[PDB]
Amino acid sequence: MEKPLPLRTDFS
């Protein structure tokens, strides 16, 4: 199990 990508700062 996974698929947890890091948080980003362009809400698009």
Next chain:
Amino acid sequence: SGMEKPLPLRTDFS
């Protein structure tokens, strides 16, 4: 009771 000022609730606002 002592508290006052209470008006009836409204549906229409003009």
Next chain:
Amino acid sequence: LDGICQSTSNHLWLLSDILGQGATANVFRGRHKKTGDLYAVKVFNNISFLRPVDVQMREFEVLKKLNHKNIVKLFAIEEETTTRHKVLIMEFCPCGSLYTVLEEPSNAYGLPESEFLIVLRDVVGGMNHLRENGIVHRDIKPGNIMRVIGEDGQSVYKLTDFGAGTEEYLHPDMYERAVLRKDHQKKYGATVDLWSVGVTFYHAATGSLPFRPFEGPRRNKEVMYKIITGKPSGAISGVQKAENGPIDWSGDMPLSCSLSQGLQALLTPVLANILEADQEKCWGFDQFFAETSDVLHRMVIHVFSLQHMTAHKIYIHSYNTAAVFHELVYKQTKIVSSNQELIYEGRRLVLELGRLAQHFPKTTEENPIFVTSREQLNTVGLRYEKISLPKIHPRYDLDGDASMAKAVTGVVCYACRTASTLLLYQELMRKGVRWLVELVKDDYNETVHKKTEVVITLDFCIRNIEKTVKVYEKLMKVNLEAAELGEISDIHTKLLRLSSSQGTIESSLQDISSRLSPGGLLADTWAHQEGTHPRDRNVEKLQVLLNCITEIYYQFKKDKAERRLAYNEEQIHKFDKQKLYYHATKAMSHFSEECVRKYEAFKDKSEEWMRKMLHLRKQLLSLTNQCFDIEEEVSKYQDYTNE
């Protein structure tokens, strides 16, 4: 839609403030325009306009007069303002329904027993009021049992959502709808009402529905009917338990059900005779109401068996004698009445057979009447169900994640209740073993008080006839003072047989004083080492993890409601999915390694110590009865010391 108001001349409500969406109507949270008070408003759809309004308001008047707790109040029937159609002003129950109550994870495996009795008390009292006012109600379900907080804090459940061709030219296929209209009427026979009630009660007792085909009761529409119309008399639940294998009947509550054994004994027969297909052997309302309200009028005495390490609720009437109390205690513990020693708040407890239950000492689950036998008994323990986490689907699925989360919360929630009971069992064991030791001290102290009463009357008789030998053989005939006489020399040797054989009564009574002493061979040193303790804080440690898992579950619900997540919010949801499994497993293995294992170690050290103490009480009894045999032996020999 949004910011839309309906109103009557006296109330108003927001269409968004919806409490209940049914097929015929909808219910909204509203207010009384002039006072501001909250009421529920039931407003009917466009397809509820299919039977005359003269007989529709005939129904509603006869309901507006129903005044009783356990029935939601119908306050007024008013007409909406713009449109003109009828609305009901009802009692607002802000706590929701029993359905929302059973939807919590704490009640995932059934209600706590105290709350169950309330659902039972209130549902039965509601039906009775409806039956008495000539109203049938077959749709009784958790969905429409409301919950209100009574002014004493305990719940009050309230009922609601109840009412008040030419044949010779017909095609034979349509002729079948001209004979199944009056004949397919397998008429209900008035016992249909309480099938729902019985299913509801099982639901509230166990957290699950009584008759379940695998894949769910709704996906598998057909196998459902095979179960309802084939359930043996007395069976209580039918479960598929397999992709398509045979169905599994049972007349018992599940192990997951935490209700007392005493209550299940009262409850199972009610459900057994309430879930029955025919009218003949199924109960009628007169019998159901009479048999149930018997359960309600019983009081509860808590007793705890030290030999078994098991707690017990005794469901008994206020007017029942001490004799039935013993019987009820035998039915759960297999300890017969003449074998029951009662201990309460450190001292023994005598029941005068005339004493009524209302005059018994007040008990709580943590202040119980202990019960012990002088005979041997094996330790049983707390019989609970071994539940482990479900498997976690690695898929990112908002529906599936919320469901998996509800399940995990409910399992950790169960482990958390069980662990709590395991600590009570250990803390109650300690409280009882402590007193039991002190009661064998009273028993030993009584034996010594009797021994030092017989040892001094034995002595005042021995030197009473030996001082006559000081005159018979010393001052008169002066010859050897050893030749025996006839009458008294046989009772002199008989007294020396007591005084000397009693010397070894002390050597054994001193040994039991030593093994019962504080640092002795029967010290309760295992009780202070071998278990978990209130200071270990295992319950609140679990609680802390259960709070994290619960907080995630509530969120995973909001995620499901939002239907699909933004980018950052999706990664957090994914991250919190791993967090949830981490916390759950951390809790579940802590339940295993700390709570259970140290409890089982304690359960076994108490079975060792129990055998030891029984042996000692059997020895101290064997010695006590010798003091009464020496008591009566000196009784018949003492008055012979008259001269």
Next chain:
Amino acid sequence: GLDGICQSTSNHLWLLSDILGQGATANVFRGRHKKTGDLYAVKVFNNISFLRPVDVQMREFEVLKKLNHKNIVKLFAIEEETTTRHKVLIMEFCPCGSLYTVLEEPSNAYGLPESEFLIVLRDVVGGMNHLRENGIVHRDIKPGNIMRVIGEDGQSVYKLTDFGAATEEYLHPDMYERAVLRKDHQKKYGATVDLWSVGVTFYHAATGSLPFRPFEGPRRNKEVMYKIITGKPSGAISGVQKAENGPIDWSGDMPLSCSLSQGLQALLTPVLANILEADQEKCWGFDQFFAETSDVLHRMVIHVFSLQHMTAHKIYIHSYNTAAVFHELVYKQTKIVSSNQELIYEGRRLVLELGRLAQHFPKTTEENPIFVTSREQLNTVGLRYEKISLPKIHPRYDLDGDASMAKAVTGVVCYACRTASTLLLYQELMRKGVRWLVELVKDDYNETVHKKTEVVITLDFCIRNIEKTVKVVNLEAAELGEISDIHTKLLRLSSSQGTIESSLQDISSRLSPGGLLADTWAHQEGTHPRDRNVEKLQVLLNCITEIYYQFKKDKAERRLAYNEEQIHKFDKQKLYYHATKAMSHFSEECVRKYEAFKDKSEEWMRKMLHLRKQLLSLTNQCFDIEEEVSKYQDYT
């Protein structure tokens, strides 16, 4: 399609709406680690500018980042905000807020519960000390900067935070004031100033109010406040201007409203009075403060309940302390001496071995205490609580006023509700005790009659020696002389023993279940658990609390929409209706029945001590007869 509400660093991000703290130099936001999603609190210095070059406060931060102690909130990293390059400190997020938000709850309007208080004391002192060990102290510890965490075991863990780490002949006479003289008289006060703040915080935590108040609030009256903290008599811990511009009411004890145990107050009041002292000497030092408080924290607590005063007690005793000092500690609160203290634990009498360690005393809880009673007469005191009434609810519609009013009212009904619960405990304990005492006297009775009959089978058996058909028809030397005087005392001993049994039975008929010492008042008078009086109060307190919380929200909005205004005005009536109902219920049902039970126990106690005197007199009377017969038993 717009930004400007999201700050970041290369490793964290945060939403400018998720603001946890505001301050002159920086703000604090709730943020996340980009790669892991874990939450941290990020403090962003938007106005780092001060009198302190950035290099000084940056070497500070590197020093604090090394700190690693359970009562300091960890400073993980020092970062730069992505676009403004402002210094950001990322640090451990305590989701429970601060000790400020705790003391702001109405359930703590009158101090924290004792168990929580001890936690604040332990952890504040623990952090304070760890600071000194690393050569930092700030004199600025207040609830505002004490963070709260829930520990692995569910107990609070408080954590310190927000502490730093490190012309002339041509000027006016008014510039020469401060430029060469007045800003030069800064006497760099140190060492003892630090503790003043910690003292005010502990008073505040313990009472729910501030220790020095000039009637107009410490802020609105700037002047009287300085007059208080500089003229405070030694040993005083609170100064309050009760009336408008009246004298200051000094006190050196906690207020009655303080629910803290009389035992802990006795330990706390010293360390307050010596901490709140405004001179170099006369005030304590750190080394003494740490040791003195460490003494309170290393103490365990034993619960005892005085049946005759009807009062509960916490005994703060060391585990190595000896049973003799246990009696001392009970004497200090009970005013009953050690040779007078009879101890009862779980239905039976307790024997204080005079040398046993408290570590080995029976475990006790507030509801499973050790009971204490004496044979001497004692007047019942009962619970000492303060009688607090609802404030005046003024009828105007005012969002600020109504919020402040609802908070006060919620606080009064918590005190009422908590006090109501203790009243029920004192009665439930009293009943458990009376029941147990009565069974103990029955053991003292059975012990006496066990020796009365034990001695009669010696009188009747030794009378059968000198007064049988063996001892004593004309006779002049057949024993009628000096032994006939012992047969006379032995006859008057056997007959006097007759009325011993007559009085002995009379007390058995009062100890009997139906007799005139039966504890029948105990189950009739006063309130019971089945009365559900506390949860009744609780139900009202929840209505009141929910309203107060909504009135906070309304106050925040500053202006209510039309319907909401009118709902808020109705809720204000509901709030006053619930509160006066809860209050009058507390008065006419909990207190009124409790006092009735109190007076019935004072009356029943007199009857008890009067029977215990009598039964004693009959016990001694038997040891006397045993004594006077054990002499004539040895003849020749």
